[PDB]
Design an enzyme around this catalytic site. Sequence first.
Site, PDB file in Angstrom:
ATOM      1  N   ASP A  90      44.175  36.242  35.226  1.00 61.63           N
ATOM      2  CA  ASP A  90      45.571  35.621  35.289  1.00 61.63           C
ATOM      3  C   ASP A  90      45.806  34.188  34.550  1.00 61.63           C
ATOM      4  OD1 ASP A  90      48.105  37.377  35.887  1.00 61.63           O
ATOM      5  OD2 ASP A  90      46.794  37.555  38.064  1.00 61.63           O
ATOM      6  N   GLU A  96      52.436  35.637  35.131  1.00 61.05           N
ATOM      7  CA  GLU A  96      51.164  35.297  35.448  1.00 61.05           C
ATOM      8  C   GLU A  96      50.555  34.031  36.254  1.00 61.05           C
ATOM      9  OE1 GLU A  96      49.786  38.514  32.779  1.00 61.05           O
ATOM     10  OE2 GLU A  96      50.723  37.977  34.737  1.00 61.05           O
ATOM     11  N   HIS A 108      51.346  34.665  39.649  1.00 60.25           N
ATOM     12  CA  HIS A 108      50.439  35.702  40.243  1.00 60.25           C
ATOM     13  C   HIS A 108      49.267  34.666  40.705  1.00 60.25           C
ATOM     14  CE1 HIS A 108      51.990  39.000  37.738  1.00 60.25           C
ATOM     15  NE2 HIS A 108      52.774  38.945  38.722  1.00 60.25           N
ATOM     16  N   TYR A 154      47.346  34.228  44.572  1.00 59.90           N
ATOM     17  CA  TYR A 154      46.297  34.287  44.912  1.00 59.90           C
ATOM     18  C   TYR A 154      45.580  33.149  45.867  1.00 59.90           C
ATOM     19  CZ  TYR A 154      45.642  38.068  41.832  1.00 59.90           C
ATOM     20  OH  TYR A 154      46.146  39.435  41.318  1.00 59.90           O
ATOM     21  N   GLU A 163      45.793  43.532  30.835  1.00 55.73           N
ATOM     22  CA  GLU A 163      46.856  43.986  31.583  1.00 55.73           C
ATOM     23  C   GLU A 163      46.629  45.452  32.282  1.00 55.73           C
ATOM     24  OE1 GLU A 163      49.866  40.762  30.584  1.00 55.73           O
ATOM     25  OE2 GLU A 163      49.464  42.202  32.491  1.00 55.73           O
ATOM     26  N   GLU A 215      52.274  43.760  36.255  1.00 56.18           N
ATOM     27  CA  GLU A 215      51.072  43.861  35.261  1.00 56.18           C
ATOM     28  C   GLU A 215      51.562  45.418  34.484  1.00 56.18           C
ATOM     29  OE1 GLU A 215      50.124  41.192  35.454  1.00 56.18           O
ATOM     30  OE2 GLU A 215      48.644  40.398  36.934  1.00 56.18           O
ATOM     31  N   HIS A 251      54.198  44.435  32.078  1.00 56.44           N
ATOM     32  CA  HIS A 251      53.695  43.788  30.945  1.00 56.44           C
ATOM     33  C   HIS A 251      52.845  44.730  30.063  1.00 56.44           C
ATOM     34  CE1 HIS A 251      53.373  40.179  33.822  1.00 56.44           C
ATOM     35  NE2 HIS A 251      54.617  40.593  33.775  1.00 56.44           N
TER      36      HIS A 251
HETATM   37 FE   LIG Z   1      50.424  40.438  33.301  1.00 57.60          FE
HETATM   38 FE   LIG Z   2      49.581  38.696  36.229  1.00 57.37          FE
END
Ligand SMILES: [Fe+2]
Ligand SMILES: [Fe+2]
Lengths: 291, 288
Positions: B62, B93, B96, B100, B161, B195, B198
């Site tokens: 990411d 991204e 994302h 995490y 992706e 994703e 994407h």
């Molecule tokens: Fe993505």
């Molecule tokens: Fe992502």
Amino acid sequence: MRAVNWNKKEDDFSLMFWKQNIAQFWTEEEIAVSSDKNTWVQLSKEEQIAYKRVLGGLTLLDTKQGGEGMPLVLVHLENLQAKSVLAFMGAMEEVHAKSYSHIFTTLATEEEIDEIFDWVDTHPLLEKKAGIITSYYRRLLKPEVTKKELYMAMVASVFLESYLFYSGFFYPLYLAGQGKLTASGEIINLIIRDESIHGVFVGILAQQIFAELSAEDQQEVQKETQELLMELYEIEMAYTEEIYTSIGLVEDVNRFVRYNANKGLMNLGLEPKFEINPIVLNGLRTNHDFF
Amino acid sequence: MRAVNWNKKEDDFSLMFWKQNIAQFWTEEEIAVSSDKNTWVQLSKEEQIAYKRVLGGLTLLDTKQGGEGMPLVLVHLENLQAKSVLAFMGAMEEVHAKSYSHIFTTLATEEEIDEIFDWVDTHPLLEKKAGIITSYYRRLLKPEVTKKELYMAMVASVFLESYLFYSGFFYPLYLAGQGKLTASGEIINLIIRDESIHGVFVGILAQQIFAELSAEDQQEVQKETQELLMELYEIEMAYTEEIYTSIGLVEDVNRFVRYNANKGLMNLGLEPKFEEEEINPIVLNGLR
Ligand SMILES: [Fe+2]
Ligand SMILES: [Fe+2]
Ligand SMILES: [Cl-]
Ligand SMILES: [Fe+2]
Ligand SMILES: [Fe+2]
């Protein structure tokens, strides 16, 4: 190869700007503009043309910031938390550009809209203005850039964020401060709230790079920065003459451009180089602190 | 110089994807993960380590997609409406990757987290697979790119992706399908929903560019795409053996990798290359 690790701060400010950019998130679906038609039809022909033209110019600038300025500066940053913030700011530029299209749809026919975007594409001052800024961005289209090149792209970005938009923002604020087109004015205030923090953030990044430059390179980019400031000023003065002479506002807009130029310089850690219209201030009062 | 004009469609799909990307918007603060601690402590150390490692790998991918893949592909597009969508996807991204780190903070100590990221940065298979993908992106760091170069960056992006993430998504889905780490699993499901769109979108763009190549250039990139797919597969098979052997899941994750490789091909308008199998039903329950 490194992954972004928000458990280990890379600087003392990226998390704060990440959080604020997110807290400020909005989309064009949240402000309905149709109630502005009651005051739109009360504008003169000349006032309506000025409004559409300035929105066209703002769209161009946001188009280039989201599609070139933020992506090309961020790809060359080594600080992954700051990169994250710039990616988000770039996306918000695309929200801003879409929001101008939302205003246009309410206020103009499809034929009038396409005329405005044709006028933007062929306008010589807008072409020159955008060309000067994007030149600094497109210098970064190579595998390895110097800190001087990255610094000057950040300067160009601050000057777009904090300065070049304002010859355009003037007029929606001026009308909104008179109670005209106040829903569009609410959108422009959301845009300004974002651009203000974009300019501060990129300015912080620029000051960090500047401190890493040799003394010789510092004096070179200081000269380039002052020249860029005044090159853009010359173009802005020609642009305000073109847009605002028909409606009697040139000198007022020029004072506003200088005010914001000074803010751009301050965002870079630089002294002011020039010397707000109270109606514009009332249009911001829905930002008012910042200005 | 042109400004984006949403009144005049530049293509038949960018507005639809703009609207959906916006509609799916979410941020890290929307899912509290602290309730996962009750099932986290029931995992063995081997299970915990595998989970932290795959999240480390996902974070790396990411990081590169938000910071290189989306920005460099979008810079060279002429379609300003498609550019807009890609800029938004790039920002997601980064959301994302932030999410995490949220999971890590709840489940690991500060010393454990920094150990994970040092493991990511020095890992030879992660460095290799990220390097293969980013080599295609960094070819676009020049003022003018050919359509062949743009196409191959888009292929790499679809493979990241729609395919390279899934050796990592496997394990959060597998545990969530067993009622373990289900708040973290809800986050992972949001990431997967992003994703997925994407990969579809970049694949549409890739198919458009492909059609604008000469026959000679088409033949070249068709072959490079198939070689890239299998070069990455060989690396993924080493990666799954490294991560999952301790916990008995290598062949399971390899089947899931092949499933998703096939979806990446279909996103590019290409035929499947791996044996078509039903998804693991435990993973399927984690996607539910
Ligand atoms: Fe993505
Ligand atoms: Fe992502
Ligand atoms: Cl340097
Ligand atoms: Fe903007
Ligand atoms: Fe901005």
